[PDB]
Design a binder for this molecule. Structure first.
Ligand SMILES: [Mg+2]
Ligand SMILES: [Mg+2]
Ligand SMILES: [Mg+2]
Ligand SMILES: [Mg+2]
Ligand SMILES: [Mg+2]
Ligand SMILES: [Mg+2]
Ligand SMILES: [Mg+2]
Ligand SMILES: [Mg+2]
Ligand SMILES: [Mg+2]
Ligand SMILES: [Mg+2]
Ligand SMILES: [Mg+2]
Lengths: 117, 45, 97, 176, 139, 199, 47
RNA sequence: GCUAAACCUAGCCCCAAACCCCACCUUACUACCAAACCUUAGCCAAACCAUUUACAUAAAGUAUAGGCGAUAGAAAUUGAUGGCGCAAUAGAUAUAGUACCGCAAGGGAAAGAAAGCAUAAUAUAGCAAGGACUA
RNA sequence: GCUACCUAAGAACAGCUAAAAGAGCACACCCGUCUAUGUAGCAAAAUAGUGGGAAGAUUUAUAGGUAGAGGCGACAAACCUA
RNA sequence: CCUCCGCAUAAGCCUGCGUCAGCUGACAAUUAACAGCCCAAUAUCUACAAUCAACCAACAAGUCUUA
């Protein structure tokens, strides 16, 4: 009778409560006998770096100078990453400079994005 | 004797007045459209 | 108790603002301008009753005729219902025949 | 260690904790991808500690010591995320020309509204996907009247807003 | 990670890796007595117990022996002045049992006005013998 | 049969600084040139040999303001630290305070010192008091017969636009008792709980 | 101002370690951390 | 002297102008398995009802139609930002399509800034007053 | 989601007597004969007692179906959200 | 002194007599083994009730997969 409260897994009968989840991403599948097979590759692996010797800190000293925000753009990145090599080879086949015709074949495809965060 | 005509069951509620059943027919889609036009917070049951 | 207990804030009317001061100018545009323009062309208002007058039934018929296609859906429905009702009232009700 | 979920023991009970300034987007833009990767976890550990402090302060019904550092950390993490997203977007635009990381398409739903349908990842082609084919991405003619009604409701709201604004301006001019 | 589309895995594909974790957890004092090796966390609803185990073992190098979770329902009973229900958020609670006999106990966190105070000192309350007569006057 | 009609539930569910704290250095009645300079350097115009006249004028004028409850002027005439004392206990009662010629000339006693001035002035004047009730019946002091008043008045000043205002009157312990009150008073002893006994 | 134990020195915060590259943070960090992944991401359908 | 009384802008009305991250059709808001188009009717008027009626200007209510009756009805041709609005029972239903009511479709609010009593019960007799009276 | 009927797959029916029962007495359960109370009620049809059936044409949970000149009906013009 | 009462499950409801301080607010809480959420397919298979299933008694003829 409650139309306004959100529908969750706490509400329906046993079947409803079992079937609905809370948004947690799937980790494996269900075989015969409702035995859950967890796929290792489906489990997010946290790639945590080694922080030993790291100098950066959660906060920055107020003594740092103010600066003007300059959001990175495709043009700026191209100028700062490809333009030097292009000039040096033009004065003297774009894959040599970095461009890849297609994202297929890469582990981290830029579109459709296939990596987390 | 009377008054308790509502015997709640979420299965019947959803199968009878749910979003899926509303969209299952053009008449139900127009029900949803009317609720949307009126600005109902709850479009379906 | 249907009486306010304090004097209302004073209402100051500028009888000599531009609107009042120039009110009525060009009402004789026709007879003083070789009848190039009729005074009714000075009337600013709804397109369907510029330089025209009628009772409510005639007004509604004219509104539907002239801007009915541009009316919102429910406004037009209300206008059609009003025309129907006014037709019934003016043609079937009343003291006189 | 679990001690990383709490501030330094010396700071426990201090009415105030002195903290620096939140990382700015411009400051972060100068850091490498590895440096940002490590700073993300530095900030994450700090954020977890601060959230633990907030919850324990609520539990003890005491004010949280220097709550502003939680805002600073959240802002720093948002700036780091924005910088990384900017780099990824620039790279994607260069290599593919796509302005959006996720595939999508403009589609007219069953209610006649134009929506940006974001695609989902499937294993079978769409023409075989039964659940997908149940979903309707077209509006039948009976929806046109409701589309007009919605448009006119929007128009009425807009007209009321504009007239109210003009009347308020007139009142202001009369007042001054 | 949360609020992100997970790349769909197919058999033989690469391991799913998250580099900048979006999950932020809180270590909370239990409301009831817990075993010495149990640590209570408040977790994002989208985080699995496997994710929490890997999270604690990778970011904090905490040896985790067991993880259990439950979804705590936040009250929807409170109503604002408009009679509209105010929903306290639901949240996920995790109980983490540490490994190798390791023990944890929640630490004991939390272990103008001058003029007002000194004026309160110098109130000079009226004496009963004064009978309400102002004593300020020198007569 | 006609069904009952329920009325809406909402109808039946309705429910209902320029002051200091006291005295920096209390004067004890029976070398302050540093403070004199410390006030001169900030005021640029002052005369100790003429201050007593102004202090007396301010004192008398403020006491006259008390007569008519001129709180607007009293706020400027006395410090905020003093105003509650000046005007609290006297609320809802008429005072007929008046001044008569002084007995000895007023002279300064000592001065000290974000920065707040402080001047102690000794006065031995003659005054009249008559404090009434809400109902206009005398309760303190004859209105006609004057009394001699010895006061050690401490003025405080703000150091940019503030002036010298009454801050606090120092009553020495050796001062004579004030005037007796017309009405008698009862002073209850220690109230006893059921289990307690008087001793 | 005195830096706290959790405040970066100005020189550290200003050091420009960013080398504009055509690599995503993910793949750059994979190289830096030496994570080796040979499995190829199987193609999926989007719609 | 209690309860109360009052208030003025929150907004609205009519014109003119202008064309206006993630999740979700499965039990919606749930990461991931092999098919549309088709006369409106009737109330109502005809004092019933049955054909019928009932979903710029001027020509003209004319020609025509019509149980030739109720009534219906052309064309050729002619050429064309404001408020003697509302001001919280009004003006939008609107503080909100919320609360609340209903299984559902659906219905749908309220509100913000005198009366009644008490001071002081009551006196033969009566539409409660009037003529009066020193009363 | 009541109710009428139906579909699918479930469940309940003590004890005694009798023997494979639309069998007897009688619990649970279902019903509602008669009386009293209640009648703005505990209740927009209830309570107490009394009474009928109680291994069957029974009762009953769950999900599904039949829709308004229609459905459904062991025809009472009964029921289809008081 | 009283009770076809009580405890669980289902269904339903959704925090609705836990703590704290002033009905309101804050704080806490239900931890999977129970239960739900299943099954890789193609075909081929599967006459012989149940009723303590053994006699006895029938008719209304009754959830029945391996390569
Ligand atoms: Mg039922
Ligand atoms: Mg669990
Ligand atoms: Mg008729
Ligand atoms: Mg024509
Ligand atoms: Mg209103
Ligand atoms: Mg009165
Ligand atoms: Mg039996
Ligand atoms: Mg029998
Ligand atoms: Mg029957
Ligand atoms: Mg009959
Ligand atoms: Mg009959």
């Amino acid at each position: 009778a409650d139309r306004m409260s959100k529908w969750t897994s706490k509400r329906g009968p046993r079947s409803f409560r079992g079937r609905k989840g809370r948004g947690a991403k799937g980790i494996g599948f269900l075989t015969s006998g409702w035995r859950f097979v967890q796929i290792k590759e489906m489990v997010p692996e946290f790639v945590v770096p080694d922080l030993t010797g790291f100098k950066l800190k959660p906060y920055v000293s107020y003594l740092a100078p103010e600066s003007e925000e300059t959001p990175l753009t495709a043009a700026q990145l191209f100028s700062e990453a490809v333009a030097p090599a292009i000039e040096k080879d033009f004065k003297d086949n774009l894959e040599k400079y970095g461009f890849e015709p297609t994202q297929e074949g890469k582990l981290f495809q830029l579109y459709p994005r296939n990596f987390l965060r | 004797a009377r008054g308790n005509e509502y015997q709640p069951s979420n299965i019947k509620r959803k199968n009878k007045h749910g979003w899926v059943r509303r969209l299952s027919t053009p008449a139900g889609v127009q029900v949803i459209l009317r609720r949307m036009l009126k600005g109902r917070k709850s479009l379906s049951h | 108790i249907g009486i306010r207990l304090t004097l209302p804030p004073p209402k100051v009317v500028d009888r000599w603002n531009e609107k009042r001061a120039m009110f009525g100018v060009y009402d004789n545009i026709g007879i003083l301008g070789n009848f190039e323009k009729h005074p009714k062309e000075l009337i600013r208002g709804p397109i369907w009753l510029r330089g025209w007058k009628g009772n409510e039934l005639q007004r509604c018929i004219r509104k539907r005729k002239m801007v009915g296609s541009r009316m919102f859906a429910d406004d037009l429905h209300n206008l059609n219902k009003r025309i129907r009702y006014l037709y019934k009232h003016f043609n079937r009700h009343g003291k006189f025949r | 260690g679990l001690e990383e979920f709490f501030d330094d023991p010396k700071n426990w009970g201090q009415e105030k904790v002195k903290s620096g300034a939140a990382w700015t987007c411009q400051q972060l833009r100068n850091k490498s991808n590895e440096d940002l990767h490590k700073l993300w976890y530095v900030l994450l550990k700090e954020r977890n500690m601060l959230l633990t402090l907030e919850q324990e302060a609520k539990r003890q019904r005491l004010p949280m010591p220097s709550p502003e550092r939680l805002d600073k950390v959240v802002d720093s993490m948002d700036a780091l995320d924005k910088v990384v997203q900017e780099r990824e977007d620039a790279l994607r635009l260069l290599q593919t020309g796509q302005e959006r990381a996720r595939p999508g398409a403009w589609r007219r739903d069953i209610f006649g509204r134009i929506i940006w349908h974001k695609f989902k990842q499937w294993v079978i082609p769409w023409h075989l996907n039964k659940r997908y084919n149940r979903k309707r991405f077209f509006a039948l003619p009976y929806v046109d009247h409701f589309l007009r009604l919605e448009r006119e409701k929007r128009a009425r709201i807009k007209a009321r807003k504009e007239n109210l604004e003009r009347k308020k301006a007139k009142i202001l001019l009369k007042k001054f | 990670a949360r609020n992100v589309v997970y790349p769909l895995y197919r058999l033989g594909g690469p391991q799913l890796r998250v580099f900048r974790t979006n999950f932020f957890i809180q270590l909370v004092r239990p409301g009831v007595a817990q075993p010495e090796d149990t640590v209570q966390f408040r977790i994002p609803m989208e985080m699995t117990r496997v994710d929490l185990r890997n999270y604690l073992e990778g970011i904090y190098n905490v040896p985790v022996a067991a993880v259990r979770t439950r979804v705590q329902h936040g009250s929807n009973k409170r109503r604002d002045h408009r009679n509209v229900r105010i929903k306290k958020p639901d949240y996920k609670v995790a109980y983490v049992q540490l490994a190798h006999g390791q023990t944890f106990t929640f630490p004991d966190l939390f272990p103008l006005y001058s003029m007002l105070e000194e004026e309160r000192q110098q109130r000079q309350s009226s004496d009963p013998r004064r009978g309400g007569v102002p004593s300020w006057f020198g007569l | 049969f006609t069904p009952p009609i329920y009325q809406p539930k909402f109808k039946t569910e309705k429910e209902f600084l320029a002051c200091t704290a006291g005295i920096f250095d209390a004067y004890v009645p029976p070398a302050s040139q540093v403070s004199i300079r410390r006030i001169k350097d900030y005021d640029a115009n002052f005369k100790i040999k003429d201050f007593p006249e102004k202090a007396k004028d301010i004192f008398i004028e403020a006491h006259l303001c008390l007569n008519n409850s001129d709180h607007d002027r009293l706020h400027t005439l006395v410090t905020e630290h003093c105003f509650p004392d000046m005007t609290w206990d006297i609320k809802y009662k008429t005072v007929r305070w008046s001044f008569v010629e002084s007995l000895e000339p007023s002279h300064v006693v000592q001065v000290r010192c974000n920065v707040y001035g402080q001047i102690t002035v000794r006065m031995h004047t003659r005054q009249t008091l008559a404090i009434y009730d809400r109902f206009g019946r005398l309760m303190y002091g004859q209105e006609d017969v004057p009394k001699d008043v010895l006061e050690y008045v401490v003025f405080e000043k703000q150091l940019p636009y503030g002036s010298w205002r009454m801050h606090t009157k120092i009553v020495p312990p050796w001062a004579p008792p004030k005037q007796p009150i017309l009405k008698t008073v009862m002073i209850p002893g220690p109230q006893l709980k059921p289990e307690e006994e008087y001793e | 101002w005195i830096d706290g134990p959790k405040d970066t020195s100005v020189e550290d915060a200003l050091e420009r370690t960013y080398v504009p590259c055509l690599k995503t943070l993910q793949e750059e960090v994979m190289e830096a951390m030496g994570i080796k992944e040979t499995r190829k991401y199987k193609k999926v359908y989007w719609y």
